[PDB]
Each structure stands twice: as structure tokens, then as C-alpha cells.
Amino acid sequence: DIQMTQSPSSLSASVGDRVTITCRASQSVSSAVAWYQQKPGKAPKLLIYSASSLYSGVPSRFSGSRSGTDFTLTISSLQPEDFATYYCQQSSSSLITFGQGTKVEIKRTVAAPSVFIFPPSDSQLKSGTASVVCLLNNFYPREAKVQWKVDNALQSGNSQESVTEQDSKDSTYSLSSTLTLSKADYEKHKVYACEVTHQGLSSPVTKSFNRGE
Amino acid sequence: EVQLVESGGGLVQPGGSLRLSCAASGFNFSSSSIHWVRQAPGKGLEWVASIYSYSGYTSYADSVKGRFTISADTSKNTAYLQMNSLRAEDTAVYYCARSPWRWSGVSDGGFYYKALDYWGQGTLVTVSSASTKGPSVFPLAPSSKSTSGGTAALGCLVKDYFPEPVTVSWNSGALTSGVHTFPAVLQSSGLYSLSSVVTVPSSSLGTQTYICNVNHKPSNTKVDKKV
Amino acid sequence: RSKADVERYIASVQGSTPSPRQKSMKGFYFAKLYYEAKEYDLAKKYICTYINVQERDPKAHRFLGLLYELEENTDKAVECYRRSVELNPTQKDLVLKIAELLCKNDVTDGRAKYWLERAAKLFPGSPAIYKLKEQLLDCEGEDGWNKLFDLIQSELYVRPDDVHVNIRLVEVYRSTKRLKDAVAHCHEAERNIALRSSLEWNSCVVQTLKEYLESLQCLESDKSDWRATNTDLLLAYANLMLLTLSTRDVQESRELLQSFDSALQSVKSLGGNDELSATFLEMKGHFYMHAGSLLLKMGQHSSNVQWRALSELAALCYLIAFQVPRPKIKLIKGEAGQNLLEMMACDRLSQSGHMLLNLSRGKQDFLKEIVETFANKSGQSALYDALFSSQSPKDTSFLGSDDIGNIDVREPELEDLTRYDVGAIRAHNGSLQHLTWLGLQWNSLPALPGIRKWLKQLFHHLPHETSRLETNAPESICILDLEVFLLGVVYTSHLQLKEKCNSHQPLCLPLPVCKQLCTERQKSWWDAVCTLIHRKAVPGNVAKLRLLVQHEINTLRAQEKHGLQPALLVHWAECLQKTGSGLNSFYDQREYMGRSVHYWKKVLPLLKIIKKKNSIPEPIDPLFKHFHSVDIQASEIVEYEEDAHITFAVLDAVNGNIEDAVTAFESIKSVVSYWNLALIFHRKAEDIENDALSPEEQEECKNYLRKTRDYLIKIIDDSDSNLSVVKKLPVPLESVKEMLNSVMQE
């Protein structure tokens, strides 16, 4: 099977930059590749067809090119409206495959996340479950790592998290981490700590609470 | 004047069946090749089906081969994606799109399409044996006494609901700025859960009554919760 | 000998031994001469009757087996040999035959093995014995049978319209003797519009169904779905009858009628009020219609005395068919099934309708006489006589027992006929043969068919006119192009047949009997564009189909090197003007009027050269055959220039050049120009007539409404006086009067 490997997975740039995204075809493929722009939630739109031909109506700053089995999308001068995800697509014999996609995030200066931990509510304990919440607010860049400590004991496989898309005003992200297990196990430990590591933090920082405060 | 409309989506139980309808208008449906492209939440584009322009030979991805069936009707000027043996993995936003005969070339060993010009709005299909359910709201108030100087953080936990979407507002839309409502996550049980939070001046804490207003329309649920 | 020599001997021994027993005991010696006169559907029934009284004759039984061998009915031929062998063991050669045939048809049953063992001991180590030993071995194993099935299914996935492949599936089902699956697919496939039109498929359908009826599996399973399959047999018979009449010769068609009539008699007894009963209703009509068509085929070749008598007889048949009411559509289980049944109903009324007319146009109230003379039961025996041989039992023949009660004897109404045609366009998969016939049938009538509505029923959502008219790429095909195409095909077809009969009525031929009425070029184009639009082409052949259409586009649009005689262009122009001039909407008016102006603008240069009696440059392999029969003459030039100038003015009016349109319209005192002048004067008045506005303007507005009234009155005054003007009306006379009533009450 033919595979289109897209690189990079996530890109960060600012306005006016000359940006480049590349896709490699595993097998030798003919010039039947396309490029698409998909803004969050909306439908994908066609940018380039037949490798280097521009789709009618697309701005002239977009241009496609090929070298061997590597196809490349090129934007001469990035604009604010082009900060979206892109995909490359090959059409081989009775088969179509897409690249993993490339997100174009707006670049800005670093910001340190202001973290606040929250305990499970009285109402939730009534139901029989216990969820701990750890906020990471208005930081940059997207990359970060959070770890959970129950009485200074690592936990994995029982918590999950989700991250907001780059905010429009300050271009910062936010993350919500949820550590979910039964009330029975929650009443078995006293100390709870949420640690955060981030390029913006001078050193890793942690906040914690004790059941009963 | 030219558009594609997707219909026939909605939720279904695993192992069930659905049928999507891609209604076309403005271009000769005979000379256009029809495709379907799904996208799970936060995931990329996956090609699932295609129909050669002037004849209609099918071609499917191995992830759905034999289960789905795509068809085209000249009289009704509409294409469809029949889906059988639906699995939880098939939960995704399904788009359709065309490729004219100008871009449809047939070659030894299979055919190729140069690109997808016209795309649809995209109809949602959710596949999960979890039954509809309203959200349970648990408050998340600040155990802080002016921790971050003049501003504190409060929030609400919307949990144990199905299916997406849930909508949240604060003080019925009075507290608009500073709010950040996070996407939901599929708990292994089958129900989704998210959090909504806002940063407010600590000096105003206790003076301005803070209430989150959640509305889960699929289950006709409305809940206001103070923090 | 001949047919007369053998059928005259019927009266020879009939006058010597008239009792039924001796009449049937002569069947073998009757059948003795039909086998020599090449009559096998007849000889079969003669010997079979002698077998009904002399059931123990080994000679007669073998003779029928030898006759079923010529018919290639293996199951029937073998059984006949069996009876002759069990009666007389000394017939060794028949023991070989049975073993020879059992091993050739199917080896799965051990019966073929048994008879081969006996055949060996009767002919020790003969050359044929080993030959049969190798034949028996040939058949594949269980894994082999399953292997073939997968090929057909995988082949049927991408090629569901292939006649041969679907046939093989029924034969494979029949080879494993799972006939229920054979009919099941046979039933689900009678919904396919393409397969329903295939002669060889329907033939297989008749057999696989009959085989199941007699099959042990049909009785054991249940008697509930028995009715369902029985309907399809009748349906198959109807389709099969339509096709056999057109392609096959006189003899084969008549033989199929007997199977049809046998089925009808066997079905009528059950009755009821479900799909089968409704099916029996509609199929009953088809029987007579085709029977009438069958009658006319024989008479065409025959003398004049038989022609009139046969046409008289056929006229009654079509009449019986037309009378039959629209079948109860609601009573069917599904939408596909019911829609199909109605489609056939429309086909019956349409085909029989036009025939009824063309035969009635010969004389005055010719229809009335047909009923008053042959509606008598005497006609029922005269009909059975001409169609069939009287020897067959007249009791189990549906034809002889039908209750011909209160024949409507009412000629058809044109308006009803149009909606029958339009509903039956999809009856024969829109073969250009089908449409070219209808188009010709309306060529003799005073009302014209809704061709544009035909095309809308076939190619749905095909725009009336394509935006990208600049190129001839066949993605820009439009309903106008097709409408323009069919017009030429019929205008061409009419002239070709006109030339034929001149060397030797042309309207009177029924649809099956007549041969291809269009040029293979035209037919190839229509079949291509049809397969293309409906999306039943082939990825490989796409480029070829696509180019085949493109080749002719430049002609349908009167572009570079158009093979168009000036008369055909003129015919296109006026036929589109008047077609468009009667339309209500502006989009369609504009489109049809535009094209009409286009063709006009292409002709006028030709007419001017013809106006001075010069020569037109004849074409190179034209798409639409030229004819000197309709070559334009100077006597008609000034008319076309005038009639064209109208088409110019009309389009000018539709575009907005009212000043120039009126100036032209007023220049010519024509009936059509009144309806246009009035219609546009009425609009200028109606809009301004009631809003608050300058009083002086209001009086001017009223003044236009006064002109409208006058022009409509000139139409009716000139209309009632002369008939030729009534035909020139761009809309119906009653429509003109309708507006006037509202105009004056305003």
C-alpha cells in the first residue's frame, strides 16, 4: 500500500513568513497529488491540483512543487487567514490517501501557565466518584506535560486531559487535566499534587491540596 | 448556485446501519465522480469511498470494505453512502465531494482523481451504544483567598452526558470574557465530560453571584449551578 | 409437399372417421407428415394426442422423444425414450441414447451412471462407450462448482446489466438444482430495466419459472409465494412477446402466443384481489395488443383480401386492449413493482392507441363497423382460426373463452394519448426505435407530442440549455440538443420511408414489425449519450463514448460543417419557435426562441442563394440524409423570411427591444403577432393599472388595455371565419378567449 507521510505535524510561524510543508510518497507516484486547507470544523478546500497547478480562485501566494517522491506546498508570504490545518492527498490506482495533516499555529512569545488545582465537589462524592481538576491557563507553546501524584505516588492510565485551540486575543492555549477514580480510593489518600513542566516555567512547579484542607 | 448537501446522519447503535444522502445541484451529476471523506474528532481526513464519473465503479478503503456501499442515482441527482455493521470507530464527520471527468483519469490497474473541488457541509454520524443522557453539573469554586493577586478562577464540571453537544454560558451570558470551555472527552463508560472555567477578580468574589448555565438539547435538559 | 398439402389432409380423414378416438389414433400418422413439412410445434401436438389414446406404443413415444431432441429439451426427450424403452427392451440404441443424453446434460445424479452401465453391457466396449465414460468424468467437484459461482457473482457485481452473465447464474443455480434461488434472483432481476428488454434473458426467465412450477421443490416448500413467482412468468411472457415479434419470423412469434394463451387460461381460475390478479388484468390487454400486432405482420406480406380482413381482426384486438382499465396500482406490495406495472399500462394504451387511430383514419367511423360485425362471438372463432391451428383444444385456450362484453367502440382522445406516451417513454429503455416510432405516429395527427417532456422523463435534471455553449465537449449536452436531434431523426426517418413506399401504409405499421427506422449512426449516438447520462458506461470506453457524442454536436448546433439540409434547419427553427411561443415561463421562452433565431440566422444565407435559383453545396457524409423531396423552392422563400422575421421580433421582445419588436410585428399582419402584441400590451397595462400614480399616466395605461382587447378580438374574428388561421394560433383558441374574458372584466 502507498503511504503519504506529511511533515511537520505541527508548525509555528508568524505573518509574512515563507512557510513550507512536505509529503513523501512511499512508492514512486505520478503527479496526481493535491493539497487542501481545512479550517477548524469547516469543510476542506482545494488549494493545488495535479501537483503544481493552482485551483481557480486560490491566492497566488500558494504554489506546489515536486522533487523525486517528495511533494511540497509553498506559501510565499503567510497571511493571517492562512493559519489553519493543511493536508496532502495522493490518488493512486483506485485508492486515495491523505497525509496526517499540518497545523499552522501563530507564533508568539512564551507565557507561563497559571495553574490552579480543584478538588472533587461534595455533590460528586454523593454520586460515588471523585474527579480532580488541574488548570493550565493562557500559556504558549502547545507542548506541555502534566503528572499526577497521590501521596507523592505517580499515577497513569486513569486520568485524561484536553487542550483549547490557540486563543484569538493573546494566542495562548489552555489545558484541563482530569484524574478520575472512585470515592473509595479518593478517601484512601490525603495528599494530592499536580506537577507541570513547560518551557515557560523556570523550573517545574506543583500545586496540591489535602482532603479536608 | 452550486452546492452539496449532506443528510441522513445522526446517531446509531454499534452493529446498526445508517444511510447518508449527498444532494447535488448545479453541475451535471453524470459527469462527476462522487467521494466520501470522514473525519473523527480531532483527527485527519480519511477517504472511505469513490464513484467513477460516468459509470460508477466502486472503490473503498480497507477500513470499511464490504460494510459500506456508495451509490449514485441519475433520476434523483443524488449520491448516498449506505453503512452497515457500524462500529464505534466509524464515529466521524462524513463529507462528500465531486471530481469532474476533466479530473477523472482511468489507468491500468485502477483510476485516479486529480482533486476534490466541491465539498459539502458535512453531516455528523455518532456510533456508540451509550444511550442519551443529561449532564450532571458539579461546581468547581476557588479554594483560594486572593492567591493570584486580584484574580481568582472558578468553573463547572459537566459530566455523564450523551451525546455531544453541550453548551455553556455564565450568568446567562453576562460574564462573557475570561471564559474557556474545554472540549469533551469520551469516558470509557460511553458518556462525555468537559469543564468550563472563568477567571474573575478575587475582590469581586462573593459579591457578584456566579452561575454557569448548561443546556443539553439532545436530552431536553437545562441546569443552572452557582459556585 | 407444403402447408396446404398436409392441412388439407385433415379434412380427408376427418370425413372418413369422425369419432374422437379414431381422430386421435390418426395423430401419429398425422404427425408423420408434419415432421416432414418442418412443423415441430404442430407435429408435437399431433403425436401427443395419439399418445393420449395409444399410450403403449413404443414407436410413437420414441418419435416424440426424437422430436423433443430436435427441440433440445433434454428433460422431455429423455423421458420419452424411457417410455419406449420400458415398453420394448429390444431398443438397444435407445439405451445408448438415454445414457448418452444423461451424461451430456448433468452427471450429479447417479441415474446417468446407471444407464451408462447398461449401455456398456448392450454394446461391449464399443467406441461410444468410452466416449461416454470420459464425458461423465468431465464434470467438476464441489470445490469446482463453488469456484465458478464466485466468478459469476464477482463478475455480476461490476457488470449487473450483462445478459449472458446473469443467465449463467440461473444456469448455475439450476445445475445445483436450487431452483428457488434461481427464481429468487430471476424475480429480483425483473426489476432491472435493461434485463427486462433482453430477448434471451426473458426466454431463460420463462424456462426457469416453468421448471420451478413443475419442480418438486415448489410444492413441498409452501403454496404462499406460489402466486408471486407466477406473476413474473406472465410479465416475462409480455416482454418476451414484444421482442420476439420484432426480431423473429412469423412462425416463432405465433408459437409464443400459444404459450402465452396457455398461461392465461391456467391463471384466470385463481383470481383474487392481489398483485397477481392485477397483473393478470394488465397482461390480458398486452395479449390482444401483441396478438393484433402479430395479425398485422402476417397480412403485410399477404394479399389485399387477407390484409383488410386481418386488419379488421387486428383493429378489434387493439380495441380490446385499449378498453382494459388501468391496473390497480395501489394493490402491489412495493413502489418499484407498482411503478413498473403502470409503466406497462401506459405502453399498452399508447401503442394500441395510435394503431387504433391509424387503422380508423382509413375510413369514416371504421371502428364502429369493426365492433358491430366482429364483436359477435362469431369473431371469437374467426380470431382463433386465423391465429392458431384449429386442431388445438379450444377449451383451455384463453382466447376462445374470454367474455367480450360491451366493447367501448370509442376512438381515443389525443390528450389522453399524450399522457400515455409520456408515461411510457421508459417502457423500452428509451430506444431511439421507440421514440422515432412515436414521433412518426404523431406526424399524422393534428396535435403534436410533448417531446421536451419526454426528455425530462428520461434525463432528469438535464438543463434546457447549457451555459458553456462555446465548445462541443459532450459535458455540455442539453435537452434542446436532444429535442433538436429527435426532430431530425423523425424528419429524416419519415422521408426515408416515404422514398421506400414510392418505389413499392407507412403510418400503419406497428412498432415491433417495423425495422430500424433510424440510421445506425443516429442510433449509436443516442445509445452512447444515454449510457453516458444514466451513468451506465464503462471506465475504459468512457473516452470513446465521449468522443462519439462530441462528433455530432457540431451538427446539432449548426456549427462548422453541419450536415443539415436547409429544409431541416427551417423545420427546426419554426418547430422551436412555436414550441417555445406556447410556453409560460420566460427562461424556456428565451431558450427555445434563442435556438430558433440561431438556426434562422444560419438558414437565411442559404435561402438567399436559393432565392436566385443557385445550387447549394451538398454535404460530406451528412448526419441527416439530404432529400430533393423537400428541397426548398422559391415559392416558399418569402414566407420563411417573413416567418423568420417574426422569430426575430419575438426574441427582441423577450430581450427588451420592445420598440423594435413592435415596429416589426406591426409591419406584418399575422395572427401570431396579435397574440404577442396583445400579451405585451396587457402586461404594460396590468402593472400600472391600480397603483397610485399620475392620472395622465393612468389614462395612458388604460389605453394599452384597450389595445389588448382589440387584438384578441381580431384573433377570434379571423379565427372563427377560417380554419387555416385556427391552426396558426400559437396557443389554443379557447386560451385566447379565456384571457379576453378577464381582460374586459378588468
XYZ file of N, CA and C in Angstrom, chain A residues 87-177:
273
model
N -3.556 19.483 4.429
C -3.468 18.059 4.145
C -2.988 17.858 2.717
N -2.187 16.817 2.518
C -1.750 16.384 1.201
C -2.452 15.082 0.845
N -2.738 14.915 -0.441
C -3.544 13.801 -0.915
C -2.963 13.257 -2.208
N -2.773 11.944 -2.261
C -2.350 11.253 -3.467
C -3.523 10.440 -3.999
N -3.577 10.304 -5.319
C -4.576 9.472 -5.979
C -3.820 8.445 -6.812
N -3.682 7.244 -6.267
C -3.098 6.129 -6.984
C -4.230 5.307 -7.592
N -3.888 4.141 -8.125
C -4.881 3.299 -8.777
C -5.999 2.887 -7.826
N -7.212 3.385 -8.073
C -8.404 3.014 -7.306
C -8.155 3.091 -5.800
N -7.540 4.190 -5.371
C -7.228 4.407 -3.965
C -6.844 5.865 -3.778
N -7.272 6.442 -2.660
C -6.898 7.793 -2.268
C -6.445 7.770 -0.816
N -5.328 8.439 -0.530
C -4.787 8.509 0.820
C -4.347 9.934 1.130
N -4.533 10.338 2.386
C -4.220 11.681 2.846
C -3.046 11.655 3.815
N -2.337 12.773 3.882
C -1.305 12.925 4.881
C -1.914 13.100 6.259
N -1.056 13.004 7.275
C -1.525 13.139 8.649
C -2.020 14.545 8.958
N -1.650 15.527 8.145
C -2.079 16.895 8.328
C -1.002 17.742 8.985
N -1.103 19.054 8.777
C -0.135 20.000 9.320
C -0.875 21.225 9.829
N -0.765 21.480 11.128
C -1.401 22.631 11.753
C -0.418 23.794 11.779
N -0.881 24.960 11.345
C -0.073 26.173 11.279
C -0.510 27.081 12.421
N 0.223 27.038 13.530
C -0.102 27.840 14.699
C 0.608 29.186 14.622
N -0.062 30.231 15.112
C 0.532 31.562 15.153
C 1.615 31.560 16.221
N 2.795 32.064 15.881
C 3.896 32.100 16.833
C 3.813 33.372 17.669
N 4.213 33.256 18.932
C 4.275 34.395 19.833
C 5.341 34.115 20.885
N 5.505 35.059 21.807
C 6.437 34.861 22.901
C 5.897 33.838 23.900
N 6.802 33.362 24.759
C 6.464 32.331 25.728
C 5.635 32.937 26.857
N 4.802 32.106 27.473
C 3.976 32.520 28.597
C 3.924 31.377 29.596
N 3.957 31.716 30.883
C 3.959 30.664 31.895
C 2.527 30.377 32.325
N 2.121 29.109 32.414
C 0.732 28.813 32.787
C 0.481 29.055 34.267
N -0.587 29.793 34.558
C -1.036 29.991 35.932
C -1.921 28.808 36.310
N -1.429 27.945 37.196
C -2.076 26.672 37.496
C -2.936 26.824 38.742
N -4.104 26.182 38.729
C -4.982 26.125 39.894
C -5.605 24.740 39.958
N -5.384 24.041 41.071
C -5.974 22.730 41.321
C -7.324 22.900 42.005
N -8.230 21.948 41.758
C -9.580 21.954 42.316
C -9.961 20.561 42.795
N -10.585 20.447 43.964
C -10.941 19.129 44.482
C -12.269 18.668 43.916
N -12.626 17.404 44.118
C -13.976 16.962 43.763
C -15.005 17.597 44.684
N -16.174 17.878 44.121
C -17.197 18.596 44.860
C -17.964 17.642 45.769
N -18.606 18.223 46.782
C -19.475 17.441 47.652
C -20.516 16.689 46.835
N -21.095 17.350 45.831
C -22.128 16.715 45.020
C -21.596 15.484 44.289
N -20.362 15.547 43.780
C -19.811 14.401 43.059
C -19.531 13.225 43.993
N -18.968 13.492 45.175
C -18.775 12.428 46.157
C -20.088 11.736 46.500
N -21.195 12.479 46.486
C -22.502 11.872 46.717
C -22.806 10.803 45.672
N -22.378 11.024 44.426
C -22.649 10.059 43.363
C -21.786 8.809 43.487
N -20.597 8.929 44.069
C -19.699 7.808 44.237
C -18.425 7.872 43.420
N -18.133 9.005 42.786
C -16.923 9.187 42.000
C -16.184 10.419 42.512
N -14.924 10.546 42.099
C -14.061 11.641 42.531
C -13.200 12.073 41.354
N -13.370 13.318 40.911
C -12.601 13.871 39.802
C -11.816 15.085 40.280
N -10.497 15.051 40.077
C -9.609 16.169 40.379
C -9.297 16.917 39.091
N -9.299 18.246 39.166
C -9.122 19.111 38.005
C -7.857 19.940 38.201
N -7.029 20.024 37.158
C -5.807 20.824 37.180
C -5.801 21.730 35.957
N -5.857 23.042 36.184
C -5.901 24.020 35.105
C -4.513 24.508 34.710
N -4.293 24.623 33.401
C -3.159 25.344 32.823
C -3.733 26.410 31.895
N -3.600 27.679 32.276
C -4.324 28.771 31.637
C -3.376 29.669 30.854
N -3.754 29.971 29.612
C -3.145 31.027 28.808
C -1.615 30.919 28.798
N -1.134 29.828 28.209
C 0.299 29.614 28.063
C 0.645 29.431 26.592
N 1.950 29.367 26.326
C 2.471 29.094 24.997
C 3.861 28.512 25.175
N 4.258 27.494 24.395
C 3.561 26.812 23.298
C 2.664 25.651 23.722
N 2.084 24.979 22.722
C 1.178 23.867 22.987
C 1.836 22.769 23.809
N 3.140 22.575 23.655
C 3.796 21.433 24.277
C 3.872 21.601 25.791
N 3.366 20.608 26.521
C 3.465 20.593 27.975
C 3.204 19.176 28.465
N 3.601 18.918 29.711
C 3.452 17.602 30.323
C 3.033 17.744 31.778
N 1.931 17.090 32.136
C 1.376 17.119 33.483
C 1.438 15.711 34.059
N 1.744 15.617 35.352
C 1.822 14.346 36.057
C 1.038 14.444 37.357
N 0.490 13.311 37.792
C -0.352 13.246 38.977
C 0.350 12.473 40.087
N 0.227 12.978 41.314
C 0.811 12.361 42.499
C -0.277 12.171 43.546
N -0.520 10.922 43.936
C -1.401 10.602 45.055
C -0.501 10.209 46.220
N -0.392 11.095 47.211
C 0.559 10.923 48.307
C 1.974 10.764 47.758
N 2.304 11.570 46.745
C 3.629 11.552 46.124
C 3.889 10.220 45.420
N 2.847 9.674 44.794
C 2.915 8.414 44.061
C 2.399 8.648 42.649
N 3.217 8.307 41.653
C 2.848 8.541 40.262
C 1.578 7.785 39.895
N 0.768 8.401 39.031
C -0.436 7.779 38.503
C -0.481 7.941 36.992
N -0.870 6.869 36.307
C -1.027 6.883 34.861
C -2.116 5.889 34.485
N -2.701 6.091 33.306
C -3.751 5.220 32.824
C -5.112 5.445 33.440
N -5.258 6.441 34.312
C -6.527 6.724 34.964
C -6.967 8.175 34.828
N -6.177 9.023 34.175
C -6.505 10.429 34.000
C -6.411 10.805 32.528
N -7.084 11.899 32.173
C -7.101 12.389 30.804
C -7.087 13.910 30.829
N -6.846 14.496 29.660
C -6.727 15.941 29.531
C -7.191 16.375 28.148
N -7.462 17.673 28.017
C -7.829 18.261 26.734
C -7.324 19.697 26.701
N -7.034 20.184 25.495
C -6.397 21.482 25.307
C -7.243 22.338 24.377
N -7.348 23.624 24.700
C -8.041 24.554 23.826
C -7.187 24.874 22.602
N -7.851 25.341 21.552
C -7.164 25.859 20.381
C -6.609 27.247 20.682
N -5.612 27.643 19.904
C -4.950 28.918 20.126
C -5.938 30.069 20.192
N -5.974 30.734 21.341
C -6.923 31.815 21.545
C -6.679 32.919 20.518
N -7.728 33.698 20.250
C -7.651 34.726 19.218
C -7.051 36.039 19.712
N -7.170 36.345 21.004
C -6.731 37.638 21.520
C -5.245 37.659 21.862
N -4.776 36.668 22.617
C -3.389 36.606 23.057
C -2.624 35.455 22.424
N -3.299 34.578 21.680
C -2.656 33.445 21.021
C -2.091 32.446 22.029
N -2.833 32.205 23.108
C -2.427 31.268 24.143
C -3.419 30.113 24.218
N -2.950 29.002 24.774
C -3.723 27.778 24.925
C -4.105 27.572 26.386
N -4.971 26.586 26.616
C -5.355 26.194 27.965
C -5.591 24.690 27.986
N -5.339 24.079 29.146
C -5.432 22.634 29.314
C -6.184 22.286 30.590
N -7.042 21.269 30.499
C -7.795 20.748 31.634
C -7.460 19.273 31.808
N -6.892 18.922 32.960
C -6.496 17.552 33.268
C -7.446 16.975 34.308
